[PDB]
Amino acid sequence: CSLDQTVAPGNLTLCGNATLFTTFRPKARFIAPEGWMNAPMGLYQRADGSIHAGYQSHPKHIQWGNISQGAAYSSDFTSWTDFNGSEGYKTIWPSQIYDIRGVFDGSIIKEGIDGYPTILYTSTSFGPLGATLNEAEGTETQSLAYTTDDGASWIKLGYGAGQNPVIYEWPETNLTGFRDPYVFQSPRLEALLANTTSITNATGDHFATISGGVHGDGARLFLYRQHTTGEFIKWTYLGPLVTTGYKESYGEWSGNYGINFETAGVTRLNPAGAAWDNGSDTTAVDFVTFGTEQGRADHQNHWPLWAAVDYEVRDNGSIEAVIAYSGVQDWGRSYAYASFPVEGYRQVSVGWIYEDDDNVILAKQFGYQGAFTLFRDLFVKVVENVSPSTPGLFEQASWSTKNSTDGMSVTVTTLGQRVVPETLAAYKGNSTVSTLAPVMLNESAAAYTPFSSQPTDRFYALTGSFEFGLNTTAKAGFRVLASEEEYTDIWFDPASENLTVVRTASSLIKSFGNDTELAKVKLYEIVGAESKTLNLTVFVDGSVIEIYANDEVALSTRAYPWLANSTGAGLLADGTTAGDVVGVSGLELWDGLVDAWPARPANTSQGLVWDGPTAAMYGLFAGY
Amino acid sequence: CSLDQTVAPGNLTLCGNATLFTTFRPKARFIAPEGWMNAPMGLYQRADGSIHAGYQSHPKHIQWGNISQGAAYSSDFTSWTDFNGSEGYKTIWPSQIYDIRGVFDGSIIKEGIDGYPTILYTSTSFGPLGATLNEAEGTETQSLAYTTDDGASWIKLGYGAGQNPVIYEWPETNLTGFRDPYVFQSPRLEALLANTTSITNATGDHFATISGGVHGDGARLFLYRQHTTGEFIKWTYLGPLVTTGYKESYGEWSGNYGINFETAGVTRLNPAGAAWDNGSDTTAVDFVTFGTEQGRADHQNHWPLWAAVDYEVRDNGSIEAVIAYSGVQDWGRSYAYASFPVEGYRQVSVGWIYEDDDNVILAKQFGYQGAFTLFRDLFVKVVENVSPSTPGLFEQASWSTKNSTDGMSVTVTTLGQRVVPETLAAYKGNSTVSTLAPVMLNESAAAYTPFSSQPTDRFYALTGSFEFGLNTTAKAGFRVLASEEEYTDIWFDPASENLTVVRTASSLIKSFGNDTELAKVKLYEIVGAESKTLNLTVFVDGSVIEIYANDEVALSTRAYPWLANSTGAGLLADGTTAGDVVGVSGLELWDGLVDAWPARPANTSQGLVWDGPTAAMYGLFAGY
Ligand SMILES: *[C@@H]1O[C@H](CO)[C@@H](O[C@@H]2O[C@H](CO)[C@@H](O[C@@H]3O[C@H](CO[C@H]4O[C@H](CO[C@H]5O[C@H](CO)[C@@H](O)[C@H](O)[C@@H]5O[C@H]5O[C@H](CO)[C@@H](O)[C@H](O)[C@@H]5O)[C@@H](O)[C@H](O[C@H]5O[C@H](CO)[C@@H](O)[C@H](O)[C@@H]5O)[C@@H]4O)[C@@H](O)[C@H](O[C@H]4O[C@H](CO)[C@@H](O)[C@H](O)[C@@H]4O[C@H]4O[C@H](CO)[C@@H](O)[C@H](O)[C@@H]4O[C@H]4O[C@H](CO)[C@@H](O)[C@H](O)[C@@H]4O)[C@@H]3O)[C@H](O)[C@H]2NC(C)=O)[C@H](O)[C@H]1NC(C)=O
Ligand SMILES: *[C@@H]1O[C@H](CO)[C@@H](O[C@@H]2O[C@H](CO)[C@@H](O[C@@H]3O[C@H](CO[C@H]4O[C@H](CO[C@H]5O[C@H](CO)[C@@H](O)[C@H](O)[C@@H]5O[C@H]5O[C@H](CO)[C@@H](O)[C@H](O)[C@@H]5O)[C@@H](O)[C@H](O[C@H]5O[C@H](CO)[C@@H](O)[C@H](O)[C@@H]5O)[C@@H]4O)[C@@H](O)[C@H](O[C@H]4O[C@H](CO)[C@@H](O)[C@H](O)[C@@H]4O[C@H]4O[C@H](CO)[C@@H](O)[C@H](O)[C@@H]4O[C@H]4O[C@H](CO)[C@@H](O)[C@H](O)[C@@H]4O)[C@@H]3O)[C@H](O)[C@H]2NC(C)=O)[C@H](O)[C@H]1NC(C)=O
Ligand SMILES: *[C@@H]1O[C@H](CO)[C@@H](O[C@@H]2O[C@H](CO)[C@@H](O[C@@H]3O[C@H](CO[C@H]4O[C@H](CO)[C@@H](O)[C@H](O[C@H]5O[C@H](CO)[C@@H](O)[C@H](O)[C@@H]5O)[C@@H]4O)[C@@H](O)[C@H](O[C@H]4O[C@H](CO)[C@@H](O)[C@H](O)[C@@H]4O)[C@@H]3O)[C@H](O)[C@H]2NC(C)=O)[C@H](O)[C@H]1NC(C)=O
Ligand SMILES: *[C@@H]1O[C@H](CO)[C@@H](O[C@@H]2O[C@H](CO)[C@@H](O[C@@H]3O[C@H](CO[C@H]4O[C@H](CO)[C@@H](O)[C@H](O[C@H]5O[C@H](CO)[C@@H](O)[C@H](O)[C@@H]5O)[C@@H]4O)[C@@H](O)[C@H](O[C@H]4O[C@H](CO)[C@@H](O)[C@H](O)[C@@H]4O)[C@@H]3O)[C@H](O)[C@H]2NC(C)=O)[C@H](O)[C@H]1NC(C)=O
Ligand SMILES: OCCc1ccc(O[C@]2(CO)O[C@H](CO)[C@@H](O)[C@@H]2O)c(O)c1
Ligand SMILES: OCCc1ccc(O[C@]2(CO)O[C@H](CO)[C@@H](O)[C@@H]2O)c(O)c1
Ligand SMILES: OC[C@H]1O[C@@](CO)(OCCc2ccc(O)c(O)c2)[C@@H](O)[C@@H]1O
Ligand SMILES: OC[C@H]1O[C@@](CO)(OCCc2ccc(O)c(O)c2)[C@@H](O)[C@@H]1O
Ligand SMILES: *[C@@H]1O[C@H](CO)[C@@H](O)[C@H](O)[C@H]1NC(C)=O
Ligand SMILES: *[C@@H]1O[C@H](CO)[C@@H](O)[C@H](O)[C@H]1NC(C)=O
Ligand SMILES: *[C@@H]1O[C@H](CO)[C@@H](O)[C@H](O)[C@H]1NC(C)=O
Ligand SMILES: *[C@@H]1O[C@H](CO)[C@@H](O)[C@H](O)[C@H]1NC(C)=O
Numbered sequence A, B: 001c002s003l004d005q006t007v008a009p010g011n012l013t014l015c016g017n018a019t020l021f022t023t024f025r026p027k028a029r030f031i032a033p034e035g036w037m038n039a040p041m042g043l044y045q046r047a048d049g050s051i052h053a054g055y056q057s058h059p060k061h062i063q064w065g066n067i068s069q070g071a072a073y074s075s076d077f078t079s080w081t082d083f084n085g086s087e088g089y090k091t092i093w094p095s096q097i098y099d100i101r102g103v104f105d106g107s108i109i110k111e112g113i114d115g116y117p118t119i120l121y122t123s124t125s126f127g128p129l130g131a132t133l134n135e136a137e138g139t140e141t142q143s144l145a146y147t148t149d150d151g152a153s154w155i156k157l158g159y160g161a162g163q164n165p166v167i168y169e170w171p172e173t174n175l176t177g178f179r180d181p182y183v184f185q186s187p188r189l190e191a192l193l194a195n196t197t198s199i200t201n202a203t204g205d206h207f208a209t210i211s212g213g214v215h216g217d218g219a220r221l222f223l224y225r226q227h228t229t230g231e232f233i234k235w236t237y238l239g240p241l242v243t244t245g246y247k248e249s250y251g252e253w254s255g256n257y258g259i260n261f262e263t264a265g266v267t268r269l270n271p272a273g274a275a276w277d278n279g280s281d282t283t284a285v286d287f288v289t290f291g292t293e294q295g296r297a298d299h300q301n302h303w304p305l306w307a308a309v310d311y312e313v314r315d316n317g318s319i320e321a322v323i324a325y326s327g328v329q330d331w332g333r334s335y336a337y338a339s340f341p342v343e344g345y346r347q348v349s350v351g352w353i354y355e356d357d358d359n360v361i362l363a364k365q366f367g368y369q370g371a372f373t374l375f376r377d378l379f380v381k382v383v384e385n386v387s388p389s390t391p392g393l394f395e396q397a398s399w400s401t402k403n404s405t406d407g408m409s410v411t412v413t414t415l416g417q418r419v420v421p422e423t424l425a426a427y428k429g430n431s432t433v434s435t436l437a438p439v440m441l442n443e444s445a446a447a448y449t450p451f452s453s454q455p456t457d458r459f460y461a462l463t464g465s466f467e468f469g470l471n472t473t474a475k476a477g478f479r480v481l482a483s484e485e486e487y488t489d490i491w492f493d494p495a496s497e498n499l500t501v502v503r504t505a506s507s508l509i510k511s512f513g514n515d516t517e518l519a520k521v522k523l524y525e526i527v528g529a530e531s532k533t534l535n536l537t538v539f540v541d542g543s544v545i546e547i548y549a550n551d552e553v554a555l556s557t558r559a560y561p562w563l564a565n566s567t568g569a570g571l572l573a574d575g576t577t578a579g580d581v582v583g584v585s586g587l588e589l590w591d592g593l594v595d596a597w598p599a600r601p602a603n604t605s606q607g608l609v610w611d612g613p614t615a616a617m618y619g620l621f622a623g624y
């Protein structure tokens, strides 16, 4: 095992455990100290204003198992500190018959048991577990724990009748899944159900959704309501909130609804952020965010989706969320988005970016797997004065359209996503910022033009505004993590409406994934404009490439170039001519970003362990 | 619910939980503070000379489940003190994937991990578990924990490769069971195997047996040897120590070997107690004690047995224990005998006496189930100068015979059992002792003759020596827990060699068992004697009746008379005449015994709880 990054990589499978720990590792984002991580969980803003973030964690292993809550906190979403207790950075772990198979995803009741922050989580026990298996009742239940020390530790309710688990009966037979309880308050749903509370007797101020589906018949999001305010044991099943068909797709802009939901949440937004009105705010929109499984050929069969919904009240005192329009939260290698309320009328969302090493070839050599996305403010994106000649505008696929009185302009509404401003300010202020001169890409443009200032390492951000002619057939974008021999190309092609990440040359190491990423982006053309504009921002963070377009489209992916000098960046141009010109302006490079874990040393590996021959006997976890 | 014990019992199933807690409860023996108990476990003499006793425990329930080690200690086997920690009187409980289904029976390595007392125990996980089910590998494994505070708490080794569980591979396929590891030192087995240690590489000073069997092919006791002295992770399977046939019986004196062994142990005894020689002591005998299942029509299909064995060394460096003669450790409602070494060359044995409420009719009303037997010294019982005309003497069924040179007398050898002298001394010294006049039972004997002094409550001991003619057809014995309307009759019938306990009138409460208990007793006739003698001792302790005959035969059973005055005792006589006389002498009543738990109040119930609907979903425990 040579770690010489000035020559071609050897056979890196001969390298020892965690010998590649720092090589490709993100530094500017949320990531576990070591080992396996997946979904964010237990997210809440604490009483002191700081953010508590949990995550599905399996320390000292590089595959999933014994899944536990790891945790950390931050005053600004950006610089983090690990909890450190009797179980290291873990704060909840399998310990009881009802959760011994795994402490799955859960969410926070901020004023819960005895007034303390309380987590409702999926407690898993023995038996087949999965949407393509014959799962039985009891294997996935929902349980409570509360914290008296602001998340340093959690105390579970006792096992038994009238205690944990608190939700265990399946609401319908033959479920594909029954997990990821999302607890939320909703003046909107309270107002809608107020006339029906005699029917169900559920009058509490908290709601909870549970994610799943029905065998052969598509995904389901099940709605529960807390039975009585101030009491947390009894949750009354109302009915299915979202019902979709077996591998139903709303279309090209909307992924696929698969066979089963995971990590679903419910929110209400307006143009400024979170909306806490009862329906009276006409600018507010109800949204559901959700993962789907087995509706995709790649990306581990997973889509992270969202839908704008219109609520209808059923005669039995339940709510049907009718999908109005439907989109994608991130088009790349990310999943398990969780959102939570933040002071100042914000709803903040964060997901999990998985690696691109599906065959587990270098996972032990890394000594870790997984990271978070950046934290994102959600809001209703509104585009005014949209030209009706915008191609495809009235499909209304992942957006709504509203005509002006005279029919000559349109107001477009969709889900907005942007990186939280605390992170952008910290990144910029800690970086070496280079403000670059605008560039016209014409007949003289090379295929690749390096920026006049270059990154110094694999931790940087780029931004640029690309102005295209309305009938362009040119392509443009950014190349990142680039040397002569390795590079990753981010292209936008307005004629096809496709944002792609081409990774055929991303790395000399052939075991990592090299498939092309794709997102659809609609450039809403403005009345009177003779051009259309793509604002593209890219974060490069170790192996993470996280792309944002027009505060709307997100695409997270991975690139693992071997060579030490594969860090460069610049502009891409294809089919630009004297007549078909792409104007690039607002160009800026931020080199360095932020050290997101200042108390951590560079190498926080504690080694890896094997569970031994019993792992295969129990059959629950891979064991490593 | 009336608790008026001066009138007939009502419908006692209407009584609340633990309302009958003190009514039938033993006071003079080892018993849990409340709830379910079964097998003794983790027995050892601590460094200060006190005795540590563990037991299978399920607090606040009256059926088995979440099975844990409850524990207590005593300086004299007789007066006990509960441990009290974070889990009350529990000291080991299900907590890890490998033991979450139950912390089953285990035994003590006195100088174990880091020099501390260490328990090797059966750690159980998910799946079918039982001799009549299709159990798989992993469901029962063997794990270590050690104590740094003399049994107040135990620390388990970590889960994983080279740690817990330490024994998990099945030594043969299709096992009926794989549990109850019994760890022991044996100069005898070391000496026998010394010439074969090149074959196996196992040279440690501890051995361990694991109890089980093979589907369709009878029970097995598997022998392991510690691989290396001072190291406790690696245990090398040598081979089957005891192999018996599917429901094989050695005969009427020997119970039945069933289909599977439980709680088996290995010891070496001589006439004084424990023998620690290497084979050089010609008076010493190797014994195996073991439970068998599914070889009995009643008594919950369980026999607690023992066998004298002769060890043979196999060519592969293992030991075959060849059964020389085979007997019964207790003929009544007891099981799960554990034995352990005690200073002064003693081996002490103790078992579990179950209730006689198989249909679970009044278990909740009790608020507890189960107790221990008394603690018993084991030794080789030797009877000299036995007459060869003793009927059946040369069947050698549960004994051996050795002729004198002249063939006119015989030395009989068998397993001896007697109550530990510490308990007998404490019982007698704390009791009101009545020494009774000898009685000849002849033509004038009533069927029942009360003793001249009577017990004052349900806590007493009796003793008597019954002298019979060599061709008697008379019967005699003791009646206990007796009023006019309720009584329990203990008879010996020398013509049939049957000691019986007739329980047809034991209680007015009809839900308790009333079947007749039976033990075989051989009266070894002495050369020149014109009579044969039965020394019979009976302990009455709440509902326990525990009978000992000739320091050899033990029979534990239950009687639950309702009436407050059903406490009397006296002599029984049947078919005694002027010519067929039974002489009774050495008669003594000890009224009161000892309060075995002086720190406990009378009612130590903490109520009962239900596990809720998930108990049936998981399917592992009854849930109450
Ligand atoms: C199989 O058997 C298993 C083992 O028995 C069993 O698991 C056990 O289940 C029981 C029963 O559910 C659990 O008991 C509960 O424990 C809760 C506390 O849990 C936390 O703390 C304990 C104890 O912590 C001490 O000890 C440890 C270990 O040494 C130390 O690390 C600690 O520092 C601490 O040490 C101090 O105290 C020691 C003695 O206790 C001293 O020795 C020492 O010197 C120190 O001073 C921990 O062990 C727990 O850890 C475990 O669990 C966590 C998850 O929770 C895991 O992460 C971890 O790995 C461990 O597994 C944990 O940290 C108690 O709160 C709880 O008691 C409440 O509930 C019951 C009702 O069920 C009531 O009877 C009781 O009165 C309590 O309720 C009151 O309190 C709260 C307020 O605090 C109220 O919400 C409630 O309404 C009520 O209020 C009352 O009082 C109010 C105020 O006065 C009043 O106003 C009200 O009106 C009202 O009257 C209960 O005891 C036990 O933790 C489990 N143990 C383990 C190891 O798992 C398992 O379930 C069984 N399985 C099956 C299938 O049956
Ligand atoms: C799924 O995830 C689960 C959760 O992660 C996981 O379970 C956990 O597994 C890990 C790994 O196996 C366990 O970690 C071990 O813990 C042992 C100690 O266990 C006891 O103590 C802990 C901690 O107790 C503190 O905290 C609790 C809780 O607050 C308090 O109640 C205590 O009072 C105590 O508090 C003090 O300390 C705190 C911080 O630690 C402070 O906050 C506080 O202020 C106090 O000061 C308890 O939690 C344990 O309870 C649990 O387990 C018991 C059963 O054991 C249950 O009954 C109970 O209900 C709980 O479930 C328990 O009481 C450690 O000894 C052990 O560390 C040794 O082993 C590892 C090797 O594996 C070494 O890395 C390490 O160095 C240690 O080895 C050395 O030490 C011993 C000597 O002591 C030697 O034998 C050994 O050779 C070695 O010696 C070294 O040092 C020598 C001297 O210097 C030197 O000479 C030698 O040469 C050598 O170098 C390890 O940390 C963890 O307990 C589990 N936790 C739980 C909750 O279950 C589960 O396995 C996972 N499942 C799967 C399927 O993967
Ligand atoms: C005395 O001790 C017992 C523990 O043994 C305490 O708890 C009770 O245990 C018994 C089992 O011994 C439970 O009986 C079972 O009940 C279920 C149905 O229960 C439902 O209906 C009840 C009647 O109103 C109700 O009390 C229950 O409410 C509890 O449970 C829910 C969770 O489901 C929880 O949310 C509540 O807060 C309560 O904790 C519940 O709604 C029944 O299906 C079982 O039937 C089987 O067994 C019986 C007997 O053989 C048989 O007849 C059936 O055919 C079937 O085989 C079983 O009857 C009882 O529910 C428990 N009660 C509780 C927890 O309140 C009991 O509390 C102790 N008493 C006191 C005064 O302390
Ligand atoms: C690096 O990190 C790993 C954790 O990932 C550390 O532990 C090793 O993990 C790997 C899995 O990643 C284990 O590989 C498996 O090994 C078994 C066979 O193991 C046996 O033979 C080994 C070779 O000598 C030996 O080391 C093992 O000894 C350990 O385990 C026993 C208990 O069985 C215990 O008593 C000992 O004390 C040791 O702890 C053992 O005897 C093999 O069956 C597995 O095969 C599967 O997977 C591979 C890979 O896909 C495949 O090729 C097979 O076809 C099959 O699919 C697997 O190879 C390895 O055994 C673990 N080694 C240990 C625990 O020592 C590792 O230690 C870390 N290294 C360092 C230097 O820290
Ligand atoms: O829910 C997202 C799907 C997903 C994606 C990758 C996984 O992750 C990787 C990425 O290459 O694939 C491997 C699993 O085959 C895993 O070792 C690795 O971390 C995974 O466990 C779930
Ligand atoms: O291993 C001894 C067999 C045995 C005997 C009785 C049991 O015990 C009793 C006694 O009536 O039977 C009942 C089980 O049906 C149990 O509630 C009760 O304690 C038991 O669980 C195992
Ligand atoms: O770590 C768990 C969290 O990860 C999520 C989101 O990816 O997916 C469940 C993944 C999963 C794990 C084990 C299985 O047997 C299975 O079929 C699917 C959540 O649904 C969940 O709470
Ligand atoms: O509490 C356990 C201890 O009790 C013993 C002795 O009676 O028997 C096992 C009883 C048993 C429990 C659960 C089962 O599924 C089963 O088939 C038998 C031991 O073998 C053991 O360690
Ligand atoms: C980068 O490193 C490679 C390999 O060491 C070298 O060939 C190349 O000239 C370097 N510089 C580049 C590609 O700009
Ligand atoms: C790389 O090394 C592995 C052993 O880890 C070996 O199996 C594989 O064939 C090697 N690949 C080569 C030499 O290309
Ligand atoms: C309410 O009605 C809906 C629509 O038929 C149904 O799916 C749901 O199960 C009902 N809720 C109940 C029975 O609680
Ligand atoms: C909206 O405007 C477009 C363009 O003028 C027109 O084709 C369409 O019919 C209008 N829709 C409505 C509902 O008026």
Ligand SMILES: *[C@@H]1O[C@H](CO)[C@@H](O)[C@H](O)[C@H]1NC(C)=O
Residues within 6 Å of the ligand: A076, A078, A079, A425, A426, A427, A428, A429, A430, A594
């Ligand atoms: C650098 O980042 C830190 C950590 O997020 C932040 O608090 C600080 O304000 C930043 N420095 C600037 C903007 O100068």
Ligand SMILES: *[C@@H]1O[C@H](CO)[C@@H](O)[C@H](O)[C@H]1NC(C)=O
Residues within 6 Å of the ligand: B005, B006, B007, B483, B484, B485, B563, B565
């Ligand atoms: C015992 O009590 C019963 C019922 O109260 C009574 O009939 C009887 O006379 C009493 N004394 C006896 C049986 O010696």
Ligand SMILES: *[C@@H]1O[C@H](CO)[C@@H](O)[C@H](O)[C@H]1NC(C)=O
Residues within 6 Å of the ligand: B011, B013, B014
């Ligand atoms: C005793 O009470 C139970 C209720 O616990 C009842 O079912 C049974 O029939 C009663 N037996 C009688 C009255 O004999």
Ligand SMILES: *[C@@H]1O[C@H](CO)[C@@H](O)[C@H](O)[C@H]1NC(C)=O
Residues within 6 Å of the ligand: B016, B017, B018, B019, B020, B021, B022, B603, B604, B605, B606, B607
């Ligand atoms: C014993 O105590 C328990 C628990 O407090 C109580 O429910 C029960 O009625 C008591 N029984 C007696 C006989 O005092």
Ligand SMILES: *[C@@H]1O[C@H](CO)[C@@H](O)[C@H](O)[C@H]1NC(C)=O
Residues within 6 Å of the ligand: B237, B238, B239, B240, B314, B316, B318
């Ligand atoms: C040793 O031989 C015996 C007798 O055939 C056999 O039962 C046992 O399994 C053998 N031991 C091994 C293979 O370790």
Ligand SMILES: *[C@@H]1O[C@H](CO)[C@@H](O)[C@H](O)[C@H]1NC(C)=O
Residues within 6 Å of the ligand: B388, B403, B407, B408
């Ligand atoms: C033992 O003694 C009996 C009675 O004298 C006799 O029948 C038997 O043959 C003797 N056995 C041996 C082995 O000498």
Ligand SMILES: *[C@@H]1O[C@H](CO)[C@@H](O)[C@H](O)[C@H]1NC(C)=O
Residues within 6 Å of the ligand: B076, B078, B079, B425, B426, B427, B428, B429, B430, B594
């Ligand atoms: C009474 O019993 C106690 C407890 O076992 C014992 O220590 C004491 O010696 C006994 N009293 C006597 C024999 O007088």
Ligand SMILES: OCCc1ccc(O)c(O)c1
Residues within 6 Å of the ligand: A387, A388, A389, A407, A408, A409
């Ligand atoms: O096909 C869209 C035709 C059209 C309708 C109204 C407009 O204002 C427009 O610019 C184009």
Ligand SMILES: OCCc1ccc(O)c(O)c1
Residues within 6 Å of the ligand: B387, B388, B389, B407, B408, B409
């Ligand atoms: O049947 C036993 C005959 C017998 C042999 C030797 C004796 O010493 C005896 O008393 C009887």
